[PDB]
Amino acid sequence: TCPFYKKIPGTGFTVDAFQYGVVEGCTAYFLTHFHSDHYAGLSKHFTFPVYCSEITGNLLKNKLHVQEQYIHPLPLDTECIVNGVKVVLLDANHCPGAVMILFYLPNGTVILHTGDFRADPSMERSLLADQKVHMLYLDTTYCSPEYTFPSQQEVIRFAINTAFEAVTLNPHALVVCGTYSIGKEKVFLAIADVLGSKVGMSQEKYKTLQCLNIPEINSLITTDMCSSLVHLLPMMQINFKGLQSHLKKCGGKYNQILAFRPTGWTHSNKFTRIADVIPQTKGNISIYGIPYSEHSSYLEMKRFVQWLKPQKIIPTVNVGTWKSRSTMEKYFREWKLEAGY
Ligand code: NI
């Protein structure tokens, strides 16, 4: 059964609630982004209206074969009327096509559902600036002060510099980047751009990338692995055994692999700066874990919430334990007392 924090009161609406069968009283199903914990349950047999971004709708139609007549893509930053209720979709600074959703309830309540997001000051100048928000349904993935990580820009600088150094020292090195979902495309696109290569990948991953409206993409990606010196592989194969095996398959074109695993946070964040990151090495293979996050840090999250000044917060992540729930509630109270709302 659908949990309360996926239901929007005073509407017929649910958010990211496709794995519960037919939800009692739901007249429209919203999907914030195409990640499997959120789309779980959609297919060609789904016959209710799905509301989402244009990019999410491309992925629904092509990857899950949902029928066109049930996909309702909406433009961003535009007031739209859905089953008699005004809504707006805003960029969530998560993966491609990810949105936050503002609902203007008929009784005057305004609700923001962040979906998954990486808070940014740029959000303080969207259509959020223009009115009061009563209730916030918040992505609390990293809601604890130990979660610090660098900007995306610093992490991409590290990766480009690392890859360009290695391949310039050894023109026979291969770069490999791990992936298991959409998001984090900048990592592999930035490295391929500095090396003057396309990124090579499986037909299934190429298909997924062609649904994303990224400009000049035919220029950056390919399925011809032989023509590429940056390869994308499943995240599970980014280990010494999986990479040794891949190197065998390249037929003596390469004699070294430099591989990247973009993770979210790991505890090496608490001690080490990005500058200082080192790989694990075995023989002619090196693996770098880089902290490229598409979720808010604790400090980014706090700044957003203290700016927005909601009257009530409903966490959507880490809600399954009493210790997590109590921790989060304590931070929300600190933030409110410090800012004075
Ligand atoms: Ni996500």
Short mmCIF file of C-alpha atoms and ligand atoms in Angstrom, two decimals:
data_model
loop_
_atom_site.label_atom_id
_atom_site.label_comp_id
_atom_site.label_asym_id
_atom_site.label_seq_id
_atom_site.Cartn_x
_atom_site.Cartn_y
_atom_site.Cartn_z
CA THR A 1 0.00 0.00 0.00
CA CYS A 2 1.04 3.53 -0.87
CA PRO A 3 2.75 5.40 2.01
CA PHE A 4 1.39 8.82 3.15
CA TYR A 5 4.45 10.81 2.07
CA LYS A 6 3.67 9.92 -1.63
CA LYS A 7 0.17 11.38 -1.47
CA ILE A 8 -0.68 15.09 -2.08
CA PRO A 9 -3.66 16.03 0.25
CA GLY A 10 -6.65 17.73 -1.32
CA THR A 11 -5.95 16.32 -4.73
CA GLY A 12 -6.29 13.12 -6.65
CA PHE A 13 -2.49 13.00 -7.01
CA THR A 14 0.42 10.70 -6.17
CA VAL A 15 4.19 11.22 -6.63
CA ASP A 16 6.54 8.40 -7.60
CA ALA A 17 3.94 5.73 -6.62
CA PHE A 18 3.83 3.09 -9.41
CA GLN A 19 4.60 -0.09 -7.39
CA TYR A 20 1.40 -0.28 -5.31
CA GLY A 21 -1.09 -1.29 -8.05
CA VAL A 22 -4.13 0.98 -8.51
CA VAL A 23 -4.01 3.58 -5.73
CA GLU A 24 -7.43 4.25 -4.24
CA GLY A 25 -8.62 7.67 -5.37
CA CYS A 26 -5.65 8.53 -7.59
CA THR A 27 -6.68 10.32 -10.82
CA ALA A 28 -3.14 11.28 -11.95
CA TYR A 29 0.32 9.79 -11.26
CA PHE A 30 3.32 12.17 -11.31
CA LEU A 31 6.87 10.90 -11.96
CA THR A 32 9.70 13.21 -10.85
CA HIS A 33 12.58 11.40 -12.74
CA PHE A 34 13.61 8.18 -14.45
CA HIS A 35 15.39 6.29 -11.57
CA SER A 36 14.21 2.72 -10.86
CA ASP A 37 13.24 3.25 -7.13
CA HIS A 38 10.82 5.91 -8.44
CA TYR A 39 9.47 4.45 -11.77
CA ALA A 40 9.18 0.84 -10.31
CA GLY A 41 5.93 -0.66 -11.74
CA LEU A 42 5.54 1.26 -15.02
CA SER A 43 5.21 -0.64 -18.43
CA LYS A 44 3.29 -0.87 -21.70
CA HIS A 45 0.27 -2.16 -19.65
CA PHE A 46 -0.09 1.05 -17.59
CA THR A 47 -3.34 2.93 -18.63
CA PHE A 48 -3.60 5.90 -16.22
CA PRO A 49 -2.34 9.41 -16.99
CA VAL A 50 1.37 9.94 -16.14
CA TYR A 51 2.57 13.51 -15.78
CA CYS A 52 6.32 14.29 -16.15
CA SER A 53 9.00 16.24 -17.96
CA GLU A 54 9.56 15.90 -21.79
CA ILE A 55 12.83 13.97 -21.15
CA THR A 56 11.21 11.58 -18.67
CA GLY A 57 8.39 11.03 -21.19
CA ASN A 58 10.98 10.13 -23.95
CA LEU A 59 12.42 7.49 -21.63
CA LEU A 60 8.96 6.12 -20.64
CA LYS A 61 7.96 5.65 -24.34
CA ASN A 62 11.32 4.22 -25.58
CA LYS A 63 12.73 2.29 -22.62
CA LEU A 64 9.60 0.99 -20.83
CA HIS A 65 7.22 1.09 -23.90
CA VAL A 66 4.51 3.05 -22.11
CA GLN A 67 1.93 4.07 -24.69
CA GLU A 68 1.98 7.60 -26.01
CA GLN A 69 -1.70 8.31 -25.24
CA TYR A 70 -1.04 7.99 -21.47
CA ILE A 71 2.18 10.15 -21.35
CA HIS A 72 1.55 13.79 -20.48
CA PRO A 73 4.82 15.75 -20.79
CA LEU A 74 4.79 19.36 -19.36
CA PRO A 75 7.12 22.27 -20.14
CA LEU A 76 9.29 23.56 -17.26
CA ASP A 77 8.79 26.89 -15.57
CA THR A 78 5.20 27.11 -16.90
CA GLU A 79 1.88 27.22 -14.98
CA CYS A 80 -0.21 24.23 -16.19
CA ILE A 81 -3.75 23.04 -15.12
CA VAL A 82 -4.03 19.29 -14.26
CA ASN A 83 -7.46 17.91 -13.27
CA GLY A 84 -8.42 21.38 -12.14
CA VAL A 85 -5.30 22.12 -10.06
CA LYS A 86 -2.45 24.57 -11.04
CA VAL A 87 1.02 22.90 -11.12
CA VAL A 88 4.53 23.99 -12.12
CA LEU A 89 7.61 21.75 -12.88
CA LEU A 90 11.02 23.14 -11.88
CA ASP A 91 14.54 21.87 -12.62
CA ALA A 92 15.73 19.65 -9.70
CA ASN A 93 19.52 19.73 -10.52
CA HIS A 94 19.49 15.86 -10.24
CA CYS A 95 19.78 13.71 -13.43
CA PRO A 96 18.45 14.63 -16.93
CA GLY A 97 14.70 15.26 -16.87
CA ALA A 98 14.44 15.44 -13.07
CA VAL A 99 11.93 17.90 -11.69
CA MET A 100 10.51 19.37 -8.48
CA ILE A 101 6.67 19.92 -8.52
CA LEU A 102 4.78 22.97 -7.08
CA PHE A 103 1.06 22.29 -6.37
CA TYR A 104 -1.40 25.22 -5.80
CA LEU A 105 -4.24 23.57 -3.85
CA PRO A 106 -7.79 24.78 -4.34
CA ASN A 107 -8.02 25.89 -0.63
CA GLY A 108 -4.89 28.20 -0.98
CA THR A 109 -2.22 25.82 0.40
CA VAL A 110 0.97 25.68 -1.66
CA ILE A 111 3.08 22.44 -1.60
CA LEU A 112 6.61 21.86 -3.06
CA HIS A 113 7.72 18.20 -3.71
CA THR A 114 11.47 18.28 -4.43
CA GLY A 115 11.66 14.77 -5.88
CA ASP A 116 15.39 13.92 -5.75
CA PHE A 117 17.41 17.20 -5.93
CA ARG A 118 20.75 18.92 -5.39
CA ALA A 119 19.86 22.25 -3.83
CA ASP A 120 21.48 25.30 -5.38
CA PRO A 121 21.24 29.13 -4.88
CA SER A 122 20.03 29.39 -8.50
CA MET A 123 16.72 27.92 -7.23
CA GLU A 124 16.17 31.06 -5.06
CA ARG A 125 15.42 32.80 -8.43
CA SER A 126 12.94 30.49 -10.06
CA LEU A 127 9.09 30.83 -9.66
CA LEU A 128 9.69 29.79 -6.01
CA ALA A 129 10.66 33.33 -5.17
CA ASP A 130 7.11 34.66 -5.89
CA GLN A 131 5.01 32.97 -3.14
CA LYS A 132 4.83 31.31 0.19
CA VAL A 133 5.16 27.47 0.52
CA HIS A 134 3.21 25.85 3.33
CA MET A 135 4.39 22.18 3.05
CA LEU A 136 7.78 20.83 1.70
CA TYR A 137 8.18 17.10 0.76
CA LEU A 138 11.99 17.03 1.04
CA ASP A 139 14.79 14.78 -0.36
CA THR A 140 16.66 14.14 2.89
CA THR A 141 19.21 11.57 1.47
CA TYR A 142 22.23 13.34 3.14
CA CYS A 143 20.50 15.09 6.04
CA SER A 144 23.42 14.93 8.53
CA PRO A 145 26.41 17.23 8.92
CA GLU A 146 29.02 14.53 8.18
CA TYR A 147 27.89 14.63 4.56
CA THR A 148 30.18 17.20 2.91
CA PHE A 149 31.33 16.88 -0.67
CA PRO A 150 32.93 19.18 -3.22
CA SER A 151 31.15 21.08 -6.03
CA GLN A 152 30.49 19.15 -9.25
CA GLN A 153 32.81 21.60 -11.04
CA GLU A 154 35.83 20.71 -8.75
CA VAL A 155 35.22 16.99 -9.20
CA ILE A 156 35.05 17.37 -13.03
CA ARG A 157 38.31 19.45 -12.94
CA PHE A 158 40.02 16.57 -11.03
CA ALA A 159 38.74 13.93 -13.43
CA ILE A 160 39.73 15.84 -16.68
CA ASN A 161 43.23 16.67 -15.35
CA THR A 162 43.78 13.04 -14.16
CA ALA A 163 42.66 11.47 -17.43
CA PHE A 164 44.52 13.98 -19.68
CA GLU A 165 47.76 13.43 -17.66
CA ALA A 166 47.56 9.65 -17.84
CA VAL A 167 46.79 9.31 -21.54
CA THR A 168 49.43 11.95 -22.46
CA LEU A 169 52.03 9.93 -20.52
CA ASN A 170 50.78 6.71 -22.10
CA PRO A 171 48.85 7.00 -25.42
CA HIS A 172 48.05 3.29 -25.07
CA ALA A 173 46.02 3.74 -21.83
CA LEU A 174 42.20 3.15 -21.96
CA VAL A 175 39.85 5.20 -19.75
CA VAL A 176 36.76 3.40 -18.41
CA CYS A 177 33.80 5.03 -16.59
CA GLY A 178 31.15 3.08 -14.63
CA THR A 179 27.35 3.75 -14.93
CA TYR A 180 24.08 2.01 -13.74
CA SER A 181 21.41 4.62 -14.40
CA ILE A 182 21.04 8.02 -16.00
CA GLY A 183 22.78 10.92 -14.25
CA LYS A 184 26.44 11.97 -13.97
CA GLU A 185 26.92 12.12 -17.79
CA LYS A 186 29.28 15.07 -17.34
CA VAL A 187 31.98 12.77 -15.93
CA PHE A 188 32.42 10.68 -19.15
CA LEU A 189 31.53 13.55 -21.55
CA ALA A 190 34.12 15.89 -20.05
CA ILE A 191 36.90 13.27 -20.16
CA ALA A 192 36.07 12.31 -23.79
CA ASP A 193 36.09 16.04 -24.80
CA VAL A 194 39.62 16.70 -23.36
CA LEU A 195 40.97 13.52 -25.03
CA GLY A 196 39.36 14.23 -28.47
CA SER A 197 37.47 10.94 -28.44
CA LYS A 198 33.81 9.80 -28.51
CA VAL A 199 32.51 7.74 -25.64
CA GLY A 200 31.87 4.09 -26.61
CA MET A 201 29.12 2.10 -25.04
CA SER A 202 26.51 -0.72 -25.48
CA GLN A 203 23.55 -0.24 -27.81
CA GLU A 204 21.14 -0.21 -24.80
CA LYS A 205 23.07 2.63 -23.11
CA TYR A 206 23.40 4.56 -26.43
CA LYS A 207 19.57 4.26 -26.79
CA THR A 208 19.04 5.71 -23.28
CA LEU A 209 21.37 8.65 -23.97
CA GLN A 210 19.59 9.44 -27.30
CA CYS A 211 16.33 10.08 -25.25
CA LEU A 212 17.96 12.94 -23.24
CA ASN A 213 17.93 16.14 -25.46
CA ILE A 214 21.64 16.75 -24.83
CA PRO A 215 22.85 19.11 -27.64
CA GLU A 216 25.46 17.82 -30.09
CA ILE A 217 25.21 14.26 -28.61
CA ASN A 218 25.67 12.46 -31.95
CA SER A 219 29.05 14.29 -31.77
CA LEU A 220 30.06 12.79 -28.31
CA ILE A 221 28.83 9.18 -28.12
CA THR A 222 29.07 5.98 -30.24
CA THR A 223 28.53 2.23 -30.29
CA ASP A 224 31.84 1.65 -32.15
CA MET A 225 34.07 0.65 -29.25
CA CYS A 226 37.08 0.21 -31.54
CA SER A 227 37.06 3.87 -32.48
CA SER A 228 36.80 5.16 -28.87
CA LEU A 229 39.37 5.51 -26.03
CA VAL A 230 36.79 6.29 -23.34
CA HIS A 231 34.50 3.28 -22.64
CA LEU A 232 31.38 3.04 -20.45
CA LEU A 233 30.70 -0.16 -18.57
CA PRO A 234 28.20 -1.28 -15.93
CA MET A 235 29.15 -0.13 -12.43
CA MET A 236 29.43 -3.80 -11.33
CA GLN A 237 32.28 -4.47 -13.72
CA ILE A 238 34.41 -1.58 -12.23
CA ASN A 239 36.74 -3.89 -10.23
CA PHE A 240 40.16 -5.52 -10.92
CA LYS A 241 38.68 -8.77 -12.35
CA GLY A 242 36.06 -7.06 -14.49
CA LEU A 243 38.58 -4.59 -15.93
CA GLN A 244 41.33 -7.24 -16.64
CA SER A 245 38.66 -9.09 -18.64
CA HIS A 246 37.68 -5.98 -20.56
CA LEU A 247 41.33 -5.25 -21.37
CA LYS A 248 41.66 -8.79 -22.85
CA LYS A 249 38.80 -7.98 -25.23
CA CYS A 250 40.49 -4.92 -26.68
CA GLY A 251 42.94 -7.13 -28.62
CA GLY A 252 46.25 -5.49 -27.66
CA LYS A 253 45.18 -1.96 -28.53
CA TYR A 254 45.74 -0.95 -24.91
CA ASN A 255 48.15 -1.89 -22.14
CA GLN A 256 46.76 0.05 -19.12
CA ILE A 257 43.28 1.06 -17.74
CA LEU A 258 42.46 4.16 -15.73
CA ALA A 259 38.84 3.70 -14.39
CA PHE A 260 36.42 6.05 -12.61
CA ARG A 261 33.57 5.12 -10.15
CA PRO A 262 31.46 8.15 -9.49
CA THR A 263 29.92 7.38 -6.07
CA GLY A 264 27.78 9.72 -3.91
CA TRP A 265 29.39 10.19 -0.48
CA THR A 266 31.97 7.87 1.02
CA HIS A 267 33.68 8.39 4.55
CA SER A 268 37.00 9.32 2.83
CA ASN A 269 35.09 12.74 2.44
CA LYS A 270 35.46 13.36 6.22
CA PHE A 271 39.29 13.35 6.03
CA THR A 272 40.50 14.04 2.48
CA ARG A 273 40.17 16.97 -0.02
CA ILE A 274 39.46 16.31 -3.74
CA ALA A 275 42.98 17.43 -4.63
CA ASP A 276 44.33 14.63 -2.41
CA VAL A 277 42.27 11.65 -3.86
CA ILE A 278 44.32 8.57 -4.81
CA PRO A 279 43.41 5.39 -6.68
CA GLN A 280 43.45 1.71 -5.83
CA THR A 281 46.02 0.05 -8.12
CA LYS A 282 46.81 -3.56 -9.15
CA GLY A 283 49.32 -4.04 -11.89
CA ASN A 284 48.40 -1.95 -14.97
CA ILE A 285 44.88 -1.09 -13.60
CA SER A 286 43.97 1.96 -11.43
CA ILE A 287 40.49 2.73 -9.97
CA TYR A 288 39.47 6.20 -8.72
CA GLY A 289 36.28 6.69 -6.54
CA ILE A 290 35.20 10.28 -7.16
CA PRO A 291 32.47 11.97 -4.98
CA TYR A 292 30.24 13.30 -7.76
CA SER A 293 26.86 13.84 -6.03
CA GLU A 294 23.48 14.64 -7.60
CA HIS A 295 21.93 15.03 -4.08
CA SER A 296 22.20 18.07 -1.74
CA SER A 297 25.01 18.15 0.81
CA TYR A 298 23.85 18.86 4.40
CA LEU A 299 24.89 22.55 4.07
CA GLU A 300 23.17 23.01 0.62
CA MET A 301 19.98 21.45 2.03
CA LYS A 302 20.00 23.63 5.16
CA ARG A 303 20.51 26.83 3.08
CA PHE A 304 17.53 25.98 0.80
CA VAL A 305 15.16 25.19 3.61
CA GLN A 306 16.19 28.30 5.67
CA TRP A 307 15.59 30.39 2.52
CA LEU A 308 12.20 28.80 1.69
CA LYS A 309 10.88 28.92 5.34
CA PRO A 310 8.24 26.19 5.00
CA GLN A 311 5.61 25.76 7.67
CA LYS A 312 5.87 21.91 7.72
CA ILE A 313 8.57 19.48 6.35
CA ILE A 314 7.77 15.90 5.30
CA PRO A 315 11.03 13.87 4.67
CA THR A 316 10.89 11.42 1.73
CA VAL A 317 14.24 9.60 2.36
CA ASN A 318 15.63 7.76 5.44
CA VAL A 319 12.09 7.47 6.88
CA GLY A 320 12.23 3.71 7.81
CA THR A 321 14.02 3.96 11.21
CA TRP A 322 13.03 5.83 14.39
CA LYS A 323 16.69 6.94 14.94
CA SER A 324 16.84 8.50 11.41
CA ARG A 325 13.48 10.17 11.74
CA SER A 326 14.39 11.68 15.18
CA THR A 327 17.75 12.92 13.87
CA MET A 328 16.15 14.69 10.92
CA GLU A 329 13.40 16.30 13.10
CA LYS A 330 16.12 17.69 15.41
CA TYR A 331 17.92 19.35 12.48
CA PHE A 332 14.69 20.83 11.11
CA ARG A 333 14.05 22.46 14.56
CA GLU A 334 17.60 23.82 14.78
CA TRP A 335 17.23 25.36 11.31
CA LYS A 336 13.95 27.03 12.20
CA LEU A 337 15.31 28.43 15.54
CA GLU A 338 18.51 29.70 13.96
CA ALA A 339 16.67 31.45 11.04
CA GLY A 340 13.68 32.62 13.12
CA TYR A 341 10.66 31.38 11.08
NI NI B 1 17.23 9.66 -8.06
#
